[PDB]
Amino acid sequence: NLCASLRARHTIPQCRKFGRR
Incomplete structure (x- = not known):
């Protein structure tokens, strides 16, 4: 998010949890 x-x-x-791809 932020x-x-x-x-x-x-x-x-x-941030790592938010983005995984």
């Missing part, structure tokens, strides 16, 4: 920058994939693990 996750956009690669930083989220590092400081925001929730």
Whole structure:
């Protein structure tokens, strides 16, 4: 959702759950 920058994939693990593909 809010996750956009690669930083989220590092400081925001929730980003990983959001995107799986």
